[PDB]
CSV table of C-alpha atoms in Angstrom, one decimal:
chain,number,residue,atom,x,y,z
A,1,UNK,CA,-39.6,-25.2,-54.1
A,2,UNK,CA,-38.5,-26.5,-50.7
A,3,UNK,CA,-35.4,-27.9,-48.9
A,4,UNK,CA,-34.6,-29.9,-45.8
A,5,UNK,CA,-32.7,-28.7,-42.7
A,6,UNK,CA,-31.5,-30.7,-39.7
A,7,UNK,CA,-32.1,-29.3,-36.2
A,8,UNK,CA,-30.0,-30.5,-33.2
A,9,UNK,CA,-31.5,-30.4,-29.7
A,10,UNK,CA,-35.1,-30.6,-31.0
A,11,UNK,CA,-37.7,-31.1,-28.2
A,12,UNK,CA,-38.8,-34.6,-29.2
A,13,UNK,CA,-39.1,-37.6,-26.9
A,14,UNK,CA,-40.2,-41.2,-27.2
A,15,UNK,CA,-41.0,-43.6,-24.4
A,16,UNK,CA,-38.2,-46.1,-24.0
A,17,UNK,CA,-36.5,-48.6,-21.7
A,18,UNK,CA,-33.5,-47.2,-19.7
A,19,UNK,CA,-31.5,-48.2,-16.6
A,20,UNK,CA,-31.8,-45.7,-13.8
A,21,UNK,CA,-29.5,-45.0,-10.9
A,22,UNK,CA,-30.3,-44.2,-7.3
A,23,UNK,CA,-29.6,-40.8,-5.7
A,24,UNK,CA,-30.1,-39.8,-2.1
A,25,UNK,CA,-29.2,-36.9,0.2
A,26,UNK,CA,-26.4,-37.5,2.8
A,33,UNK,CA,-24.6,-46.2,8.8
A,34,UNK,CA,-24.8,-49.2,6.5
A,35,UNK,CA,-28.4,-49.4,5.3
A,36,UNK,CA,-30.0,-52.4,3.6
A,37,UNK,CA,-30.6,-50.0,0.7
A,38,UNK,CA,-27.0,-49.1,-0.2
A,39,UNK,CA,-27.6,-45.3,-0.2
A,40,UNK,CA,-24.0,-44.7,0.6
A,41,UNK,CA,-23.3,-45.7,-3.0
A,42,UNK,CA,-26.0,-43.4,-4.3
A,43,UNK,CA,-24.8,-40.2,-6.0
A,44,UNK,CA,-25.6,-37.3,-3.8
A,45,UNK,CA,-28.4,-35.1,-5.1
A,46,UNK,CA,-28.3,-31.4,-5.7
A,47,UNK,CA,-29.9,-29.3,-2.9
A,48,UNK,CA,-32.4,-27.8,-5.4
A,49,UNK,CA,-33.6,-30.3,-8.1
A,50,UNK,CA,-34.4,-28.6,-11.4
A,51,UNK,CA,-38.2,-28.6,-12.1
A,52,UNK,CA,-39.5,-27.3,-15.4
A,53,UNK,CA,-43.2,-26.9,-16.2
A,54,UNK,CA,-44.4,-27.8,-19.7
B,2,UNK,CA,-21.1,-41.3,22.1
B,3,UNK,CA,-22.0,-43.4,25.2
B,4,UNK,CA,-19.2,-43.6,27.8
B,5,UNK,CA,-19.6,-45.9,30.8
B,6,UNK,CA,-17.0,-45.6,33.5
B,7,UNK,CA,-16.0,-47.9,36.4
B,8,UNK,CA,-16.8,-47.3,40.1
B,9,UNK,CA,-15.4,-45.4,43.0
B,10,UNK,CA,-12.0,-46.5,44.2
B,11,UNK,CA,-10.7,-46.4,47.7
B,12,UNK,CA,-7.0,-47.4,47.6
B,13,UNK,CA,-3.9,-47.1,49.8
B,14,UNK,CA,-0.6,-45.4,49.1
B,15,UNK,CA,1.9,-47.4,47.0
B,16,UNK,CA,-0.8,-49.7,45.6
B,17,UNK,CA,-2.1,-49.8,42.0
B,18,UNK,CA,-5.5,-48.7,40.7
B,19,UNK,CA,-7.3,-49.9,37.5
B,20,UNK,CA,-10.0,-47.8,36.0
B,21,UNK,CA,-12.3,-49.2,33.3
B,22,UNK,CA,-14.0,-47.0,30.7
B,23,UNK,CA,-16.5,-48.7,28.4
B,24,UNK,CA,-17.7,-47.2,25.0
B,25,UNK,CA,-20.4,-49.6,23.8
B,26,UNK,CA,-20.7,-50.0,20.0
B,27,UNK,CA,-18.1,-47.3,19.4
B,28,UNK,CA,-14.8,-48.9,18.5
B,29,UNK,CA,-15.6,-50.3,15.1
B,30,UNK,CA,-16.1,-48.1,12.0
B,31,UNK,CA,-17.5,-49.0,8.6
B,32,UNK,CA,-15.5,-48.5,5.4
B,33,UNK,CA,-18.0,-47.8,2.5
B,34,UNK,CA,-15.4,-48.3,-0.2
B,35,UNK,CA,-14.6,-51.8,1.3
B,36,UNK,CA,-18.0,-52.8,2.6
B,37,UNK,CA,-16.5,-54.1,5.8
B,38,UNK,CA,-16.0,-53.2,9.5
B,39,UNK,CA,-12.5,-52.1,10.7
B,40,UNK,CA,-11.1,-50.9,14.0
B,41,UNK,CA,-11.5,-47.1,14.0
B,42,UNK,CA,-8.7,-44.7,14.3
B,43,UNK,CA,-10.4,-43.1,17.3
B,44,UNK,CA,-8.4,-42.0,20.4
B,45,UNK,CA,-9.2,-42.4,24.0
B,46,UNK,CA,-7.8,-39.7,26.3
B,47,UNK,CA,-7.5,-39.9,30.1
B,48,UNK,CA,-7.9,-36.8,32.2
B,49,UNK,CA,-7.8,-36.1,35.9
B,50,UNK,CA,-9.4,-33.5,38.1
B,51,UNK,CA,-8.2,-32.7,41.6
B,52,UNK,CA,-10.9,-31.2,43.9
B,53,UNK,CA,-11.1,-27.6,43.0
B,54,UNK,CA,-8.1,-27.5,40.7
B,55,UNK,CA,-7.9,-27.4,36.9
B,56,UNK,CA,-8.0,-30.3,34.4
B,57,UNK,CA,-4.9,-32.4,33.9
B,58,UNK,CA,-4.0,-34.6,30.9
B,59,UNK,CA,-2.6,-38.0,31.5
B,60,UNK,CA,-2.2,-39.7,28.1
B,61,UNK,CA,-4.1,-41.0,25.2
B,62,UNK,CA,-4.4,-44.4,23.4
B,63,UNK,CA,-4.9,-44.9,19.7
B,64,UNK,CA,-7.1,-48.0,19.5
B,65,UNK,CA,-6.1,-49.1,16.0
B,66,UNK,CA,-3.0,-50.9,17.0
B,67,UNK,CA,-3.1,-49.7,20.6
B,68,UNK,CA,-0.4,-47.1,20.3
B,69,UNK,CA,-0.3,-45.2,23.6
B,70,UNK,CA,1.4,-42.0,24.8
B,71,UNK,CA,1.6,-40.6,28.3
B,72,UNK,CA,2.7,-37.2,29.6
B,73,UNK,CA,6.2,-36.6,30.8
B,74,UNK,CA,5.4,-36.0,34.5
B,75,UNK,CA,3.6,-39.3,35.1
B,76,UNK,CA,5.9,-41.2,32.7
B,77,UNK,CA,7.1,-44.5,34.1
B,78,UNK,CA,4.2,-45.4,36.4
B,79,UNK,CA,1.0,-45.1,34.3
B,80,UNK,CA,0.0,-47.5,31.6
B,81,UNK,CA,-3.0,-47.1,29.3
B,82,UNK,CA,-4.3,-50.1,27.4
B,83,UNK,CA,-7.5,-51.1,25.6
B,84,UNK,CA,-9.3,-54.4,24.9
B,85,UNK,CA,-11.0,-54.2,21.5
B,86,UNK,CA,-13.0,-57.4,21.9
B,87,UNK,CA,-14.7,-56.2,25.1
B,88,UNK,CA,-14.3,-52.8,23.4
B,89,UNK,CA,-13.2,-50.9,26.6
B,90,UNK,CA,-10.1,-49.1,27.8
B,91,UNK,CA,-8.1,-49.6,31.0
B,92,UNK,CA,-6.0,-47.1,33.0
B,93,UNK,CA,-3.4,-48.6,35.3
B,94,UNK,CA,-1.9,-46.1,37.8
B,95,UNK,CA,0.6,-47.4,40.2
B,96,UNK,CA,2.6,-46.2,43.2
B,97,UNK,CA,0.1,-43.5,44.1
B,98,UNK,CA,1.2,-41.0,46.8
B,99,UNK,CA,-1.3,-38.9,48.7
B,100,UNK,CA,-1.3,-36.4,45.9
B,101,UNK,CA,-2.9,-38.6,43.2
B,102,UNK,CA,-6.4,-38.6,44.8
B,103,UNK,CA,-8.8,-37.0,42.2
B,104,UNK,CA,-11.6,-37.9,39.8
B,105,UNK,CA,-10.5,-39.5,36.6
B,106,UNK,CA,-12.3,-39.1,33.3
B,107,UNK,CA,-12.1,-41.0,30.0
B,108,UNK,CA,-12.7,-39.0,26.9
B,109,UNK,CA,-13.4,-39.8,23.2
B,110,UNK,CA,-11.5,-38.2,20.3
B,111,UNK,CA,-12.5,-38.6,16.7
B,112,UNK,CA,-8.8,-38.1,15.6
B,113,UNK,CA,-9.8,-36.1,12.5
B,114,UNK,CA,-7.0,-33.9,11.2
B,115,UNK,CA,-9.0,-30.7,10.9
B,116,UNK,CA,-10.0,-31.0,14.6
B,117,UNK,CA,-6.8,-31.5,16.6
B,118,UNK,CA,-7.3,-33.0,20.1
B,119,UNK,CA,-11.1,-32.6,20.1
B,120,UNK,CA,-12.8,-34.3,23.0
B,121,UNK,CA,-16.3,-35.3,22.0
B,122,UNK,CA,-17.8,-37.4,24.9
B,123,UNK,CA,-16.9,-37.9,28.5
B,124,UNK,CA,-17.5,-40.5,31.2
B,125,UNK,CA,-19.1,-40.1,34.6
B,126,UNK,CA,-15.8,-39.7,36.3
B,127,UNK,CA,-14.3,-42.2,38.8
B,128,UNK,CA,-13.3,-40.9,42.2
B,129,UNK,CA,-10.0,-42.4,43.2
B,130,UNK,CA,-9.2,-41.7,46.8
B,131,UNK,CA,-6.0,-42.7,48.7
B,132,UNK,CA,-5.4,-42.4,52.4
B,133,UNK,CA,-4.2,-44.3,55.4
């Protein structure tokens, strides 16, 4: 006897296509960094 | 910012003196939300320094539409203008008596609300001397 349960936020990933956006840290530059979203001072970094 | 000034002036009483202050590559500002160059809201102030005395404020010009304002004491004989194409500022002081001899400074002001009447950069100073 067994039953099935659904789990939300399960650590599963699959390689996939995805659009990415620029983000810099704050003059007109040929790379439009003034339109980049400002980045956090301390980027999160998690070991696996 | 860079601030080039004119040369020494040796004038005579009752004449007129024109002092040039150049601010290379400083007038225009860039608007990111518009992706274009506009005339900045900067202000150019004009100060004077008699030998040994304290600083004196003449007047300031807002370069956007050239809106000027002079002090009450010198009102009526001093005109401040600017040329945005050559990107410089002109002081025209007329009917100088023997008391107007001094050194005249042009000063830059970012005209940001949180910093009232802040003077960022200054010129070399022009020695205007009147005598007979």
